[model samples]
Target: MKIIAYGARVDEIQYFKQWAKDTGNTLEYHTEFLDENTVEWAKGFDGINSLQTTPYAAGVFEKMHAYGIKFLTIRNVGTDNIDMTAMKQYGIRLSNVPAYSPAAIAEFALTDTLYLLRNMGKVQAQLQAGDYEKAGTFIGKELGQQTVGVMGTGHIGQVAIKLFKGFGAKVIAYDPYPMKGDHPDFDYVSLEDLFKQSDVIDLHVPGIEQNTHIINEAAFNLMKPGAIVINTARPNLIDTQAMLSNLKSGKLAGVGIDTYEYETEDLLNLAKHGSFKDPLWDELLGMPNVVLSPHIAYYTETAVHNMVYFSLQHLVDFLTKGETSTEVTG
Candidate 1:
């Protein structure tokens, strides 16, 4: 079988090749994401596998089907970008790498928490300026004393709870759909209560419709003054304006984030003709209390192994056979 993948990244090249070879398939790829401009490329391939921050429009899928394409797989977990109704209408079967490494993201948020708690961003600047005493004077907080709240309790959320507990932080989790009995070690609470009590708030939910701006100005006001928040999950879950207000007004002590509202395009364009209008970029960059990552919490070597292989495996399964567990029906 022949497959064409879109949005192929530099780090995933070896693994992608390995998977194709191991599965006895031929592979060709492109650096660009799947879209109308690139849909014609999928015409001659057996199936299409792609990982991208942007979602596919119905028109792209409609054309891919016209071009004899059927099987499709997204590399990341979030399917909010895809039009579920359109996929079904086009008779296209879709699958996604539901998860590659839960620990990849869970541990990353914990790492961010540590990075913020210790004020490492400031320390780095201090070192550059030849100030050695700033490290000792940074006045870090212990996780043991902070009450940590996890917004979701699926694989990553559960992992986060354990990781935070290992650091001696008292953890509370809130999930409309819990895996089981509110977790064995962590307390289960309402979203409101979680906001009011948690000193360190960590998010692990998908950016579903109802969850957009789940943490808004009202939520921020409910939080304990000087609260710390870390988001390795969806960007839309937190309101940017509200977060900026709190960050500016000293309502929040520190913030750590991996995803943002307009990340895929904004990050790529920050240096070129940039948004001179938005000081929010420089404000966050200059803040000593903030830690930022470019939506790569799941970009570990181990995670890459599964993300590459599994999506391909599902592609072969559905195209040659008939169905796959990873297939998204909704």
Candidate 2:
């Protein structure tokens, strides 16, 4: 079967070709992200894969249906941008990389908070000020003296728990679907308790209807003063305005965020075009206490390779077997 991939990065081109050759299949790809224009180009392909955060417009799905394509896949896990109604109407099945390397995100989250904890960004900024001595209240705390609270406990979150334990941080987590085990390293606690006790709160949960702005004013107020926060998960996980307010009042010591509001629409575009209308964008980046990235926590080589192969495996399976275990029916 012929397979096409959209938004295929340069690093993935050789691997796509290698996988096609190895699997006895023909492959095609383009660096362009999936949209109405590219939708027409995908007509003859049996299945199409992508790693785009843009919502699949109704017209794109209409074209996919007209082209007789039944399967769609993503190299990443989040399907929040999917046009659910359009997909159902067009009979397009969806699949994603459910476990594309828990270490990729877990490690990035740790690095973010750890860097901030040691005041690396602050010190680096100080270096820019030409202070050769660099001597003024620069002492930092060790993990052994802190408490870590993970907001979710699935694969990535569990891996994070183990890593935090290695650093000697007392770990705790709050999950709707809590892991059941002896679990001596960390304890499952109420969200309220977790917020109040944790020195660092690592957000690892998905964005659901109930979770919109879960970390708002009240949540921030519940956190200990001068605590650090790390979000390698979703943007809506926290309240941006409230976060900024706390950062201003010295309530929050630091933040290491990988995703934020309007990210799906404007994060990268603003880099080329201009700044976001949201004033918080400027202040958040302006603060030395903030460590922000353009949602690249899962950009490791190992993760990318696995996501490519595994997501395509679903495509191959669905085209050949009429189904895939990884298919996202929801």
Candidate 3:
């Protein structure tokens, strides 16, 4: 089978080549993302695969259908960029890698959370300026002494809870749809209670309409004055403005964020230009307490290999078997 992939990164090319050689299938990719103009390259390919945050251009799926493309496999877990209605209208099958290394993100949350708790960013800046007399200024907290609130108990959330528990920290959770099995190690508390009690809150929820801005001003108001927040999940899950206000007010101790709502457009601007023009970016970048990651929690070697290899394998499986376990109908 011939597959054309879009938005192939440098880290993914080795796995792409391995998959092609292992299966003896034709594979080609463009560094550019799939859009209206790029869809022209889909002609004669058996299927398409892409990993991008930008929305698919208007009528791009229709053009794919015209090119005889029937399947599209996405390398990431989120499909918010794909137009679900258009996929249904054009009768094209879609599949996404739902769980691409939950540990990669869970570990990142732990690492960055510790980074903030230890005041590493500020201390680094302090040391660079030849200041060694203020060890008391950056006294850090022990993870075991704090209570951790995990917002969702899905694959990633479950891993996060285990890691926190291993550190001897008290762990609580709040999931709208909690798992059916009894969990004896941790208590599942109400959302308000989780916000009120936790010293550190980690988010691992999906990006659904109901979850948009779930952590707004009211939620921030409920949190303890020095609570820390770690978000390795969807960007829209928290309100940026409200979080910023609280951070500036000294209500939030620190933040470790792997995703931002306007990251796509802002990164594009940074690529084309030298600096980001967004005022929010300016403010966040200047804050020592805000540790930012460019949506790379799932960029580990194991995760990248799975994202590249599994996406292609999913495409091949669907094309040859007429269905796949990861197929997304909606």
Candidate 4:
């Protein structure tokens, strides 16, 4: 069996190679992404495994169907970019690494939240200026006294609740699907109450169409004064313009974001010349109280291995047994 994998990064190559050793499968790895135009290269392949940030429109899948590709595996969890209706129509089997290293993202969320709470950005700026004496001025809030609101109680959210509880912070969460029932350490709260009372809010919700831009002006307005917000989830979950306005007006104390709405084009081209000419991109980067990360909350070694192994395993199962347990589509 042969499989074509796209967006294979440098660190992930070893894991795929190791999977090939174990399964004895012929894998053709491509460092670039698979798009409609590039789908021809995967013609003879039995399946396609990819990490695509761009939209996998009907056209892309139509071409793949014409090429006789049956299985598709995504390294990441979010399927918002995929046309699910078309996928089901084309009979494409989908699989994703849903629980790959929840701790990796949970830890990064906690670290970024602490960084914002402790004024680490300001401290770093002062240290760069050789102003050691000014460090004392950057006083920060203690986590024990603050109320933390978590939006979703998935694997990452559950881990984050434990970490917050360790810091003696009161944790309240809002999830339609609650894992635990009325726990003492963490209580499930309504969205209204979570927004009103949370001093520091962290989002861990999955990216779906109904919940897109969940954090908007209305949600921000309901927040406590000087609330700190952190989003390690998908970019479209929060409204960037609304967030920036709040940050500038002091309604929001700080923001640490690992993703953004226009990240598909903006982030990849950030390293290129004159990319900052885009006004929204320029303003967000210029903010003093906002911390931006390049969508790397899940960039740990263990997570990379899980992505490579599990995705390859799905392909192996399909080829050998003619069935896959991780298939997300019919």
For each candidate in turn, the TM-score is: 0.90, 0.92, 0.92, 0.87
Q: Return the candidate ranking by TM-score, descending.
A: 3, 2, 1, 4
User: Could you tell me how far off, in angstroms, the CA of residue 96 lies in candidate 2 after the best superposition?
Assistant: 1.5
Query: Where is model 1 poorest over a 10-residue stretch in terms of lDDT?
Result: 273-282
Better of 3 and 4 by lDDT: 3
Writing each residue's lDDT as its tens digit, candidate 4 over 107-217 gives: 889888888889888888788889898965878999889999999998898888888999999999999888855567788889999999999999999887888889999
Model 1: how far is 18 from its true place, Å? 1.0
lDDT over C-alpha atoms for residue 17 of model 2: 87
C-alpha root-mean-square deviation, each candidate: 2.4, 2.2, 2.0, 2.8
Q: Over the stretch 1-330, how does candidate 1's per-residue lDDT look in tens digits?
A: 989999999988998889868878998888999998898988888799999867699988899889888889877777878988888888888999887899999989999998888878878888888989875677888888889999998889988999999988899989998675435679899989999999999999988889999989999999999899999998788897789889989999889989876665575676676653446666787788888787889979999988888888889898878888888877
Which residue pairs in candidate 1 have backbone atoms (N, alpha carbon, C) closer than 3 angstroms, thus clashing? none
TM-score of 3: 0.92
What is the TM-score (0 to 1) of candidate 2?
Answer: 0.92
For every model shown, the clashing-pair count is 0, 0, 0, 0
Greater TM-score among 2 and 4 belongs to: 2
Provide the global lDDT of candidate 1 against the true structure. 0.86
Across residues 125-217, which tens digit of lDDT does each residue of candidate 3 receive? 777778866634888899999999999999999999999998899999999998998886689999999999999999999888899999999
lDDT of 2 at 70: 88
TM-score of 1: 0.90
